[PDB]
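Archive entry. Fields below.
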Amino acid sequence: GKLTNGALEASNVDLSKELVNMIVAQRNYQSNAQTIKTQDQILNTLVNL
Amino acid sequence: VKVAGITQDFTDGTTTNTGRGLDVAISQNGFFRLVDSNGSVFYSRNGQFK
Amino acid sequence: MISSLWIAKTGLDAQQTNMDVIANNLANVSTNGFKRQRAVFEDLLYQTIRQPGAQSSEQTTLPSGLQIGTGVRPVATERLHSQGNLSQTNNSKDVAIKGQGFFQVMLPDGTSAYTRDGSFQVDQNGQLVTAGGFQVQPAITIPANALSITIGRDGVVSVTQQGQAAPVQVGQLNLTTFMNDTGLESIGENLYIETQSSGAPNESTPGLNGAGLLYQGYVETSNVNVAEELVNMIQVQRAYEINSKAVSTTDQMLQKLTQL
Amino acid sequence: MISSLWIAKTGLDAQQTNMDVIANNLANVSTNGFKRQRAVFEDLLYQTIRQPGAQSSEQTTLPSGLQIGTGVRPVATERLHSQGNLSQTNNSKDVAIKGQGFFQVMLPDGTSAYTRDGSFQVDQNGQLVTAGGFQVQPAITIPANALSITIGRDGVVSVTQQGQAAPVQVGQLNLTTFMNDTGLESIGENLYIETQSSGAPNESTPGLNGAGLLYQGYVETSNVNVAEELVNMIQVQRAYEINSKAVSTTDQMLQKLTQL
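PREDICTED_STRUCTURE:
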């Protein structure tokens, strides 16, 4: 590529995409925590026999 | 699940005028070549030079 | 040691398998080109005792005899092959399939696996490879002096060199389709290998007799639905707890008998 | 007093050790330059009974004989020497490590200890000391009328004096590297001492050889990941309850024996 003098190459991070990805990742993490909690309430129920 | 890897989106970003003569922007492909105090070779897209 | 204990010991194991399937589906909610699993169950033995339909008298038959049954067993976990939603992540090296075909990839041992993941990279030698470093087939090399990579809807890979107004074709991407997509054996790393229940690998071009279409800059996400998995967890948890209660009731019954 | 009771007692002790490791990891979240611990277990001895592979007849061997095993024992507690997150405190005296080196300090016993903590102070004598007052070899004396301290990426310490246009070098901070980093014996107060399994201390400047670089104004936070510890705590609690249930079952069987 060619060099442009007097200019800087800024970052390529789009904030809207990052925010929506953060939201969906939070929901997925909560779902995984929920199934973790279910496996225990199952192990605890088996223990209380 | 297993994390196969972490990539880096090597697409050209914004070009912003700065008004200083020592900043260079690389459109399209290319990497600036640097050497540290040890002598290793490095590559960087940041054109903020001094 | 007693019949109801074995039956409720099979119920526990089947519900644990269902929970395992649900948890595995929820863990891979973000992996591209994923197909979620579904466990199927079937009845175990049925002890005959009094035979159903047995001739009690010389003219009267016994309807629906004493058929005491055994627990449950799972046949298998089948992959729900549906089209995951496509995502526009705008990179020239990501390709997504629109139909029901598979990419062919050559394993290091010389055999060929089949993957629907479209996140492709370029190795140091210039070949298209899967993100796990497995080289794609039938080999699409990419020159060092490449300016843009264009993969069309027909799988044709073109590379535009510097200062040249015409693109250069560097290969042709083909899709493999099977009689039975479920019977493929998953070997991990988003890879499936051929099994005799999956028929034979039929190679086809993308748009003809049944291979899917390829879209560049798109990634095929998983078909896992979170809400349905949540509801299924709530129902599997209740079923497991109730079967454990059956175990406990059998245990209490055996206690009094022994005490006698 | 019975074999299963000893096995369950060993399991309980191992799970308690795991819980202590988790608690120690949790207690040192705010410590700087702390490396989390992980415990590794091994399975104990085996009562032989019938030997596996013993010749039963003149030609037929016995496959997989009665190997009744004993409980479990923890072998080791290993540190995870990984680069923790760097935190900017904007202090002229705080130093952070970027690689895999160690700072060398002198205990008042006369032996040398090694610490990765970088929160340094100056004593009333003007020397560089650790927050516990241990003097930081190979020894940096800071003059009385200092205006600012500059510690370079390679370890050169300079002091800017009033009326002098040039900085004055007052020492050189060095890093010690070990061939085996996990073999160091932790004596507390963020100090590790060398053992015979920790190789020999190789002193080097930050940048040369393999030692890491020094960042001024930064502190190395602990590498403890908390959510993993919470999940491990849940697992440890459930496993401890299961082992306690095994103990209870053994106790009940012994009780039903006595009355006979």
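CURATOR_NOTE: Chains C and D do not touch (no CB pair under 8 Å).
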